């Protein structure tokens, strides 16, 4: 609705921690 790169950027930062 009003979120540009919020959903795709979410998992993007996830791997940066677990991986």
UniProtKB/Swiss-Prot annotation:
GO terms for biological process: defense response to bacterium; defense response to fungus; killing of cells of another organism. Expressed by the skin glands. Has antibacterial activity against the Gram-positive bacteria S.aureus ATCC 25926 (MIC=8 uM), E.faecalis ATCC 29212 (MIC=16 uM), and B.subtilis ATCC 19659 (MIC=8 uM). Has a less potent antibacterial activity against the Gram-negative bacteria E.coli ATCC 25922 (MIC=32 uM), and P.aeruginosa ATCC 27853 (MIC=64 uM). Has antifungal activity against C.albicans ATCC 90028 (MIC=16.7 uM), C.krusei ATCC 6258 (MIC=16.7 uM), C.parapsilosis ATCC 22019 (MIC=67 uM), and C.neoformans ATCC 90012 (MIC=33.5 uM). Has hemolytic activity against human erythrocytes (HC50=18 uM). The keyword Secreted applies. The modification Lysine amide is found at residue 19. The keyword Electron transport does not apply. Its main location: secreted. Signal peptide: none annotated. This is Hylin-a1. It is found in: Secreted. Keywords: Amidation, Amphibian defense peptide, Antibiotic, Antimicrobial, Cytolysis, Fungicide, Hemolysis, Secreted. One of its GO terms (cellular component) is extracellular region. It comes from the Eukaryota.
């Amino acid at each position: 609705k009003i979120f540009g790169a919020i959903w795709p950027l979410a998992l993007g930062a996830l791997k940066n921690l677990i991986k």
